[PDB]
Amino acid sequence: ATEFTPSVYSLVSKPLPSNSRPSATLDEQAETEDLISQLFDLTADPNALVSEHGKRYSGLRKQEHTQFLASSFFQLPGKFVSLDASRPWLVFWTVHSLDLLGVALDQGTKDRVVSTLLHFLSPKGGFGGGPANSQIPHLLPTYASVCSLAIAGNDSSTGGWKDLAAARQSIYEFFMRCKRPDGGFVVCEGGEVDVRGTYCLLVVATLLDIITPELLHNVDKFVSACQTYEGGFACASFPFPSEPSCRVSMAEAHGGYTSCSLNSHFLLTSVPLPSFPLSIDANAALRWTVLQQGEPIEGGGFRGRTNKLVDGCYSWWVGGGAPVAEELVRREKSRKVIPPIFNRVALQEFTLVAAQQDPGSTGGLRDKPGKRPDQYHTCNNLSGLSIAQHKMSHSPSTVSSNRLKFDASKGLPAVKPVAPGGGWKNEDERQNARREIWANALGWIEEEGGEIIVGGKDNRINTTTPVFNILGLRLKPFINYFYCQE
Amino acid sequence: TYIPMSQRRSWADVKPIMQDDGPNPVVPIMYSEEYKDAMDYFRAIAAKEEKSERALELTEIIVRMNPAHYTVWQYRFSLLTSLNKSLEDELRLMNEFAVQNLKSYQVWHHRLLLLDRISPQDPVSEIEYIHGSLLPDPKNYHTWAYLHWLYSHFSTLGRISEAQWGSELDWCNEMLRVDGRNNSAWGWRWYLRVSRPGAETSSRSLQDELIYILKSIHLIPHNVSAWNYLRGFLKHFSLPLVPILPAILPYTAFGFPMPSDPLPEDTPLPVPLALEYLADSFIEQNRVDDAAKVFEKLSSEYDQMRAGYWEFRRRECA
Numbered sequence: 001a002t003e004f005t006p007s008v009y010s011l012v013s014k015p016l017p018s019n020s021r022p023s024a025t026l027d028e029q030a031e032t033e034d035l036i037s038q039l040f041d042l043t044a045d046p047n048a049l050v051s052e053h054g055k056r057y058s059g060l061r062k063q064e065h066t067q068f069l070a071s072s073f074f075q076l077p078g079k080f081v082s083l084d085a086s087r088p089w090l091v092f093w094t095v096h097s098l099d100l101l102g103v104a105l106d107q108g109t110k111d112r113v114v115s116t117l118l119h120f121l122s123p124k125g126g127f128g129g130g131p132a133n134s135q136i137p138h139l140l141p142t143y144a145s146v147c148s149l150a151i152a153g154n155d156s157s158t159g160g161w162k163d164l165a166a167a168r169q170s171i172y173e174f175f176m177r178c179k180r181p182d183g184g185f186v187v188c189e190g191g192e193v194d195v196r197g198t199y200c201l202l203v204v205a206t207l208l209d210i211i212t213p214e215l216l217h218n219v220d221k222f223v224s225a226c227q228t229y230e231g232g233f234a235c236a237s238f239p240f241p242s243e244p245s246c247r248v249s250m251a252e253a254h255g256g257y258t259s260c261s262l263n264s265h266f267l268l269t270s271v272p273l274p275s276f277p278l279s280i281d282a283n284a285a286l287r288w289t290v291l292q293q294g295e296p297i298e299g300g301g302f303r304g305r306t307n308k309l310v311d312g313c314y315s316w317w318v319g320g321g322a323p324v325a326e327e328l329v330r331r332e333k334s335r336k337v338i339p340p341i342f343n344r345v346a347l348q349e350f351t352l353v354a355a356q357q358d359p360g361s362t363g364g365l366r367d368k369p370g371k372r373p374d375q376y377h378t379c380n381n382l383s384g385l386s387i388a389q390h391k392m393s394h395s396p397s398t399v400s401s402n403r404l405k406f407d408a409s410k411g412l413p414a415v416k417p418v419a420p421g422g423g424w425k426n427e428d429e430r431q432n433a434r435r436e437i438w439a440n441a442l443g444w445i446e447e448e449g450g451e452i453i454v455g456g457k458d459n460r461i462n463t464t465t466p467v468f469n470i471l472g473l474r475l476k477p478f479i480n481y482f483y484c485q486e
Numbered sequence: 487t488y489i490p491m492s493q494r495r496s497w498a499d500v501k502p503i504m505q506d507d508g509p510n511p512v513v514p515i516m517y518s519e520e521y522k523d524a525m526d527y528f529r530a531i532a533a534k535e536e537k538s539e540r541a542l543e544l545t546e547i548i549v550r551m552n553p554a555h556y557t558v559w560q561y562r563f564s565l566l567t568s569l570n571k572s573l574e575d576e577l578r579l580m581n582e583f584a585v586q587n588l589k590s591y592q593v594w595h596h597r598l599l600l601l602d603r604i605s606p607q608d609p610v611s612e613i614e615y616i617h618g619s620l621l622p623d624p625k626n627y628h629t630w631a632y633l634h635w636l637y638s639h640f641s642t643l644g645r646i647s648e649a650q651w652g653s654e655l656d657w658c659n660e661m662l663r664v665d666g667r668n669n670s671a672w673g674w675r676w677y678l679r680v681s682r683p684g685a686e687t688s689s690r691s692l693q694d695e696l697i698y699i700l701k702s703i704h705l706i707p708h709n710v711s712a713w714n715y716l717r718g719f720l721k722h723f724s725l726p727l728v729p730i731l732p733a734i735l736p737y738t739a740f741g742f743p744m745p746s747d748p749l750p751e752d753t754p755l756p757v758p759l760a761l762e763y764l765a766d767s768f769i770e771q772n773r774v775d776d777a778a779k780v781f782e783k784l785s786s787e788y789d790q791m792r793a794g795y796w797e798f799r800r801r802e803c804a
């Protein structure tokens with residue numbers, strides 16, 4: 001099972017060649033190679049039957065990470081005021097990490113999480129980064145709030161899910177006010193336009209059953225034009241008028257924006273619209289993904305951009321996009337008519353050896369050695385670790401079984417479109433859309449026998465879902481609630 | 487000594503509004519007195535929808551303490567347009583915000599909204615400022631994306647002259663000369679030479695570009711940016727790989743640049759992406775068996791971190 005995923009300790013560690021041409025990029029790369037390689041030399045090989053005497057043990061310090069998240073969840077020092085507009089992300093990074101770490105919150109803390117997030121919901125639609133009387137709605141906290149309610153909420157009167165159902169029309173109206181004719185979305189009133197907003201919007205729209213043809217128009221074209229010559233995706237694309245005459249990517253292929261673009265495109269493939277979505281170069285996206293996994297000397301972690309440093313948070317962005325890119329490649333090979341595509345072992349070794357905070361300290365996981373751990377890097381490291389530990393794939397047979405059990409006669413009230421002809425043509429088309437979107441959203445499975453837990457089964461964390469990045473045991477009851485399935 | 491805004495004569499008429507977080511909210515932040523006081527009065531300003539100079543001064547105080555507060559940035563831009571404020575002075579304030587290390591997604595977008603509304607006949611002054619700001623951080627993603635928008639937006643208005651495009655390529659060539667491993671500058675060259683709508687596509691331009699690419703590879707054979715640019719260039723224009731193979735084979739151990747007689751020091755062979763070029767060129771010649779052998783060597787020896795990926799590429803040959 002590990003024949004094509006060699007351990008970093010079993011490979012020769014060599015620095016990036018200089019070609020006798022020094023530069024600032026090589027200076028930071030060589031210094032980063034030294035920091036990571038020294039930490040691996042001080043750490044016992046996780047694949048050893050008995051840990052070596054005199055070296056650090058690389059076991060996942062789950063209780064330290066739990067304590068790190070706990071103290072950062074009940075009180076932030078004033079120095080994190082820069083995150084005052086990102087408090088729903090502080091919730092999601094905390095509650096999703098605890099889900100991955102297998103730590104349960106008591107019902108009293110869950111109710112506080114639900115009540116806090118509902119204070120962030122605006123009556124005119126969408127969640128903000130803080131209380132509704134202080135901050136305007138924003139696409140990114142809307143995703144973080146909806147997903148956090150999926151993790152900490154329930155279907156009772158105090159569970160918060162009934163409040164999301166009652167806000168479906170207003171949230172949809174907020175999404176439509178953000179939409180641009182070219183297919184992009186502003187993240188908020190007067191905000192920027194990039195694929196993060198598209199990803200966050202499409203996830204929430206998929207989960208809450210508020211997808212309409214007018215919401216998705218040109219969204220596929222905006223995302224597809226974000227792909228660069230490297231194979232990955234940039235933050236946004238620019239529409240040149242003569243709807244537009246052409247669209248051009250606006251920056252480098254980036255690990256975060258590649259994840260958002262791959263996930264957005266994947267969510268669009270579930271929508272049964274004619275000649276939709278516009279295709280992407282999946283083979284180039286898969287090639288760019290695997291090329292961002294670092295060499296053994298840098299621990300086998302992922303970098304976010306070509307010729308930049310490896311970062312633990314890209315274990316989720318780039319690593320979690322790999323099953324999506326792999327599935328898109330598989331669909332193209334099937335339309336035109338298996339070893340892991342990235343080193344699942346090396347990525348876990350980077351997480352355990354390099355990404356973990358030094359033992360006996362504050363806990364949490366970090367970007368790199370020498371960087372303070374934070375809630376964001378804790379969540380993304382563990383999310384990428386879950387992808388590496390558990391072989392995830394989108395199963396057509398599972399999607400087919402979901403189609404066979406879907407009840408089109410059950411569901412929440414249809415969304416009223418902004419434009420008169422902005423909705424689905426008839427009820428047969430809308431229910432066919434609800435079925436395909438619901439069935440494909442629940443199509444991700446963990447393949448039996450594909451599990452790889454480096455360092456022993458005590459390092460195992462729970463299985464996250466690609467595209468959504470919440471546990472399947474949270475995703476299924478949540479999306480079933482809003483589609484009225486059981 | 488801090489003076490509360492309740493004791494300030496200019497704000498005596500304003501009744502502050504407290505943050506409605508609930509009785510016991512999760513992830514609370516221990517705000518300073520100065521920050522909580524300003525947000526308490528900002529909530530009152532936004533409640534009464536006041537567009538005034540004191541509201542403008544208050545937004546500046548808040549964004550100096552929290553440059554990522556998108557709601558306050560949105561309200562500030564509405565203050566500038568409503569009061570018909572000097573957007574050039576605000577643009578100078580954003581220059582002072584860069585020296586004091588006050589940056590975020592919102593600060594860069596605020597500068598974009600300024601340039602869009604100012605709509606200068608010649609944005610050369612802003613282009614030069616962006617070039618200068620890239621010297622401390624040559625790979626700032628926000629800055630490179632903003633530079634793409636600046637040239638794209640104003641070329642749509644027909645305000646980018648041919649001399650401006652030429653000097654921009656000159657500046658991009660100098661950036662790559664200082665650091666050929668700057669993948670951000672490689673992407674900027676792709677915009678200037680390939681993707682922008684006004685780019686020239688002729689036999690001379692294709693020859694000039696291929697020469698610059700091969701020279702960059704011969705200078706830094708292990709530069710992944712140059713290899714990705716080469717593969718993207720050939721694929722975008724549907725150019726064959728075999729005619730350029732003589733310049734690539736020396737790295738797998740005519741009328742276009744060749745490697746140095748003796749290769750530069752610290753250049754261990756083979757270059758993995760050169761093997762990928764050789765394997766793809768074999769597939770171009772329908773020599774799938776020869777391509778599978780190159781993929782097998784990449785998987786088991788020369789690029790073992792991607793052993794499974796190169797094995798996948800080997801199995802596709804069958």
Ligand SMILES: CCCC[C@H]1CN(c2cccc(OC(F)(F)F)c2)C(=O)CN1Cc1cncn1Cc1ccc(Br)cc1
Pocket residue numbers: 089140195196197199200255256257260304311313317367374376
């Ligand atoms: C404590 C905040 C940390 C900010 C971090 C995450 N971050 C984000 C936060 C919320 C959502 C979301 O994307 C969405 F909405 F989920 F799709 C992205 C950003 O914007 C910036 N980052 C900075 C960072 C750290 N290490 C590498 N980087 C560069 C990077 C850029 C873009 C992406 Br994408 C991913 C990484």
Ligand SMILES: O=S(=O)(O)C[C@H](O)CNC1CCCCC1
Pocket residue numbers: 060061062063064065
């Ligand atoms: O690394 S973690 O597993 O998260 C937490 C630490 O191991 C705690 N180790 C304790 C030391 C004293 C005796 C009881 C155990």
Ligand SMILES: O=S(=O)(O)C[C@H](O)CNC1CCCCC1
Pocket residue numbers: 122123124125132133134135136528529532533557
């Ligand atoms: O009724 S709604 O418009 O849905 C919700 C309130 O109006 C929000 N007012 C806030 C005031 C402070 C700045 C952020 C907005």
Ligand SMILES: O=S(=O)(O)C[C@H](O)CNC1CCCCC1
Pocket residue numbers: 059455456457458459
């Ligand atoms: O279940 S197995 O993978 O066969 C082996 C166990 O998981 C090893 N876990 C360690 C036990 C001693 C303390 C540190 C962790």
Ligand SMILES: [Zn+2]
Pocket residue numbers: 311312313314367377
């Ligand atoms: Zn990071």
